[PDB]
Amino acid sequence: EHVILLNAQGVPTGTLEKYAAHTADTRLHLAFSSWLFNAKGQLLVTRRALSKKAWPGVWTNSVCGHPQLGESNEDAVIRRCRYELGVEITPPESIYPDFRFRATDPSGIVENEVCPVFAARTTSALQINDDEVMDYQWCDLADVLHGIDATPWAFSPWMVMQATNREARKRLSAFT
Amino acid sequence: EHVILLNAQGVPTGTLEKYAAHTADTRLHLAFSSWLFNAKGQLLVTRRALSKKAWPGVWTNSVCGHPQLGESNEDAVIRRCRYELGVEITPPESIYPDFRFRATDPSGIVENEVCPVFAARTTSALQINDDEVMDYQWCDLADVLHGIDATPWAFSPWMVMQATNREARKRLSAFTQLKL
Numbered sequence: 001e002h003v004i005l006l007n008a009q010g011v012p013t014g015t016l017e018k019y020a021a022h023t024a025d026t027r028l029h030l031a032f033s034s035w036l037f038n039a040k041g042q043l044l045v046t047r048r049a050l051s052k053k054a055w056p057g058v059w060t061n062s063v064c065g066h067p068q069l070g071e072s073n074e075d076a077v078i079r080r081c082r083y084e085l086g087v088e089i090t091p092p093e094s095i096y097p098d099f100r101f102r103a104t105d106p107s108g109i110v111e112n113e114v115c116p117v118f119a120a121r122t123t124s125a126l127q128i129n130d131d132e133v134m135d136y137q138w139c140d141l142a143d144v145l146h147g148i149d150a151t152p153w154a155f156s157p158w159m160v161m162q163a164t165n166r167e168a169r170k171r172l173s174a175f176t
Numbered sequence: 177e178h179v180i181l182l183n184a185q186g187v188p189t190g191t192l193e194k195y196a197a198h199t200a201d202t203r204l205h206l207a208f209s210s211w212l213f214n215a216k217g218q219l220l221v222t223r224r225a226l227s228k229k230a231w232p233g234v235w236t237n238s239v240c241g242h243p244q245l246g247e248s249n250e251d252a253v254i255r256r257c258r259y260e261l262g263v264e265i266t267p268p269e270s271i272y273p274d275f276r277f278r279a280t281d282p283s284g285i286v287e288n289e290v291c292p293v294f295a296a297r298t299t300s301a302l303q304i305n306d307d308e309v310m311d312y313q314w315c316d317l318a319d320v321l322h323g324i325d326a327t328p329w330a331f332s333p334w335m336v337m338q339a340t341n342r343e344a345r346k347r348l349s350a351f352t353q354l355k356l
């Protein structure tokens with residue numbers, strides 16, 4: 001598996017092995033962020049496994065990953081939903097297409113990404129991959145936003161940035 | 177290190193090795209919890225290190241631990257603040273002396289404790305011990321209480337139980353005043 005390196009503009013210039021790519025000096029690459037709701041309109045929040053190289057054990061939005069060469073974002077979302085959560089989803093829809101960020105985790109591991117954000121509904125039960133997810137919670141989008149707004153440090157920095165973007169919060173809010 | 181064992185009552189029965197004590201069954205033993213506030217009245221929230229046997233990588237109140245043989249709970253509090261946080265504190269105040277809690281952690285480690293809770297002010301800068309604490313934040317208590325209300329699952333369960341005890345919460349509130 002790989003990440004796609006991106007030049008100044010977001011042109012793909014090459015690839016790196018996924019694990020080797022995330023260091024204290026992580027270079028800009030392509031990724032996605034996804035927010036999953038069930039038929040009832042509850043938001044899935046997940047906790048990353050303690051073995052994740054970047055932000056292990058951190059509570060975050062439903063699913064995140066790295067599109068591979070030639071893979072659409074939508075497909076990468078579908079792929080990681082199946083891989084991390086064994087869950088089928090409706091066609092992902094765009095909720096924050098220009099999201100980009102750089103952050104440093106507590107051990108100094110950096111994420112540095114162009115990271116369009118999506119939402120979708122699950123259409124099957126979860127089946128948890130414990131190599132990726134150590135815990136999760138179905139909740140009210142309203143309570144999660146209240147938590148993000150009160151103690152954003154309790155959550156991943158990108159979850160926070162996405163949830164506090166005016167328009168993205170609007171589009172997520174209509175998912176209930 | 178070890179832990180002090182208590183019977184079905186809160187009466188000491190003996191001691192047990194620390195690590196060895198905390199497993200998927202763990203016997204009742206003595207512990208402490210403390211909530212630390214800086215001069216400004218901000219609350220120190222900390223994140224347990226990934227290597228912690230129990231609740232690794234979990235956000236929680238400032239410090240918790242186990243008094244050792246011959247030690248007073250307050251001395252225990254003082255020692256762990258120094259060990260984990262490198263920080264000096266004012267005499268710890270008892271804010272929830274009867275708090276008890278049994279709980280299973282995400283990987284099945286059980287904590288079964290008599291755990292009096294304290295509050296104190298820090299009197300020195302922090303020197304975080306990365307073997308024990310992987311992240312920390314100075315925050316407004318009000319904010320922390322809002323997050324705990326909104327997403328309680330995002331924090332250690334003992335942090336939440338203590339925070340929602342009315343009497344404990346009022347003592348936490350008293351420590352938000354600015355002091356010089």
Ligand SMILES: [Mg+2]
Pocket residue numbers: 063064065080084
């Ligand atoms: Mg992922």
Ligand SMILES: [Mg+2]
Pocket residue numbers: 239240241256260
């Ligand atoms: Mg401790």
Ligand SMILES: [Mn+2]
Pocket residue numbers: 003022029031066111112113
């Ligand atoms: Mn990445």
Ligand SMILES: [Mn+2]
Pocket residue numbers: 179198205207242287288289
């Ligand atoms: Mn214990």
